């Protein structure tokens, strides 16, 4: 059968190009009757066309960003490429191959689509984040971690006793914020010693907070 | 600009069907082909019923496109529900200028357990927080089983659109969704202003929760 | 068929990305299912695929 496989850095920083390239295996990209296309899938949101191009040289681009978008194919290498241009915070994203039909009297599905990549903007490389305790108001309570730069995150509740971690999301600034949180019976059970440490993974740094 | 527009959130008990329909606005949909794509969470999109009406083979016959042409929409029929029918489904056609339009999404699921109200944890800035010249208002909203998760921001009398960071459906240790209504405001808005509410609204039912210095 | 049960016959599941015809897996890396992946033994939605 044909697959696509995406190919291209997995992170990059605004100010800059977003290149990438699909490798596509099982199939001739110089073939025709078939778009080579790229779709875009914010995390948490919908799919978002970008534009698809035949082998002609023909591109067909999105009326929302078509002044910052280029596409090139090879028919030797069987490698179609998108090229950005001026990326922002916003356009960290899954990027999608697909390959559309143009077989029969209009345009089609994206028959084959590719595995998916998942890369992020943002400028910073390195980054401390800073612990905030969380006062409850049954009651909640916990840890409020802000403004770390890696992706992979270390939760640690009361030395291992236990969670629903809240994974954090790419936010205007270009970072994270993790809130993770415990549940208690009563605001008496929330006297006790309650320790909420996380470790920075890519430093081997951690950090500690006494919360109550 | 041709758009598509499908419910957001489509929840119903087992073996019985369920309806996901997307409505052209500004433009028809009987002029472009209307393609559905189940996109597993954490995996590529399927088609499982493209040119309207056909399903491609492999994908079960549960699925079913239909097209009405009177009310410019595209439904999905999906008879019998099943465990993996759990994923996204994505409505997708063209513009006449040769321009893909996808759908809103829409997130199907099928009633497991009974479903359950919705729980609000307005947190005001904390002491620390306040120091460091930042509020980080957040509604850890849990306890509720569809993935309804919406989240509408409110401030005492005006709306609130700037800041909004809520994350994807997470589940919990014991079987149950629930999610963070992030958001970052200058501290001298919230010193200025009264109170802000974080408005959920999961499953129809407007759960509100206001929180106050 | 044995009475005390098979545990030399394994299979992967749930692989990330379809395999090409004719192509074998060795590495047996456990599989990440979910947004977060697990470093050390498996756990939710980072289970191990034999």
């Known amino acids: 059968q044909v697959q696509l496989q995406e190919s291209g850095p997995g992170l990059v920083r605004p100010s800059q190009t977003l290149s990438l390239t699909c490798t596509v295996s099982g199939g001739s990209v110089r073939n025709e009757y078939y778009y080579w296309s790229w779709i875009r899938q914010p995390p948490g949101q919908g799919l978002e066309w970008i534009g698809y191009?035949?082998?002609?040289?023909?591109?067909y681009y999105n009326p929302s960003l078509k002044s910052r978008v280029a596409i090139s194919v090879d028919m030797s290498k069987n490698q179609f490429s998108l090229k950005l241009s001026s990326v922002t915070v916003a356009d960290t994203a899954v990027y999608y191959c697909?390959?559309?039909?143009?077989?029969?009297?209009?345009?089609?599905?994206?028959?084959?689509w590719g595995q998916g990549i998942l890369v992020t903007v943002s400028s910073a490389s390195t980054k401390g984040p800073s612990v905030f305790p969380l006062a409850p108001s049954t009651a909640a309570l916990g840890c409020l971690v802000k403004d770390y730069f890696p992706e992979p995150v270390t939760v640690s509740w009361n030395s291992g006793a236990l969670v629903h971690t809240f994974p954090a999301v790419l936010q205007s600034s270009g970072l994270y914020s993790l809130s993770s949180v415990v549940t208690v019976p009563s605001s008496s059970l929330g006297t006790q010693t309650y320790i909420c440490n996380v470790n920075h993974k890519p430093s081997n740094t951690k950090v500690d907070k006494r919360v109550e | 600009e041709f758009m598509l527009t499908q419910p957001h959130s489509v929840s119903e008990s087992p073996e019985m069907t369920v309806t996901i329909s997307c409505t052209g606005s500004?433009?028809?949909?009987?002029?472009?082909?209307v393609q559905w794509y189940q996109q597993r969470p954490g995996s590529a999109p399927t088609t499982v019923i493209y040119?309207?009406?056909?399903?491609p083979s492999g994908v079960p016959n549960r699925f079913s496109g239909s097209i009405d042409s009177s009310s410019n929409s595209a439904s999905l029929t999906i008879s019998g529900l099943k465990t993996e029918d759990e994923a996204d489904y994505y409505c997708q056609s063209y513009d006449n200028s040769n321009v893909a339009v996808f759908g809103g999404g829409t997130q199907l699921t099928v009633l497991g357990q009974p479903k359950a109200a919705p729980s609000v944890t307005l947190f005001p800035p904390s002491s620390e927080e306040l120091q460091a010249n930042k509020a980080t208002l957040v509604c850890l909203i849990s306890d509720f089983y569809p993935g309804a998760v919406t989240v509408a921001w409110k401030a005492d009398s005006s709306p609130v659109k700037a800041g909004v960071e809520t994350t994807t459906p997470s589940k919990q240790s014991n079987n149950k969704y629930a999610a963070s209504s992030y958001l970052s405001l200058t501290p001298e808005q919230w010193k200025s202003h009264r109170s802000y509410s974080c408005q959920v609204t999961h499953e129809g039912s407007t759960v509100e929760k206001t929180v106050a210095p | 068929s044995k009475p005390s049960g098979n545990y030399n016959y394994l299979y992967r599941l749930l692989r990330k990305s379809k395999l090409k015809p004719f192509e074998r897996d060795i590495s047996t890396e456990i599989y990440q299912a979910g947004n977060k992946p697990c470093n050390g033994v498996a756990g939710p939605n980072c289970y191990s695929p034999l």
């Open positions: 191009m035949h082998n002609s040289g023909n591109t």
């Open positions: 500004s433009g028809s949909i009987a002029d472009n082909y």
């Open positions: 697909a390959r559309v039909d143009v077989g029969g009297t209009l345009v089609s599905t994206f028959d084959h």
């Open positions: 040119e309207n009406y056909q399903r």
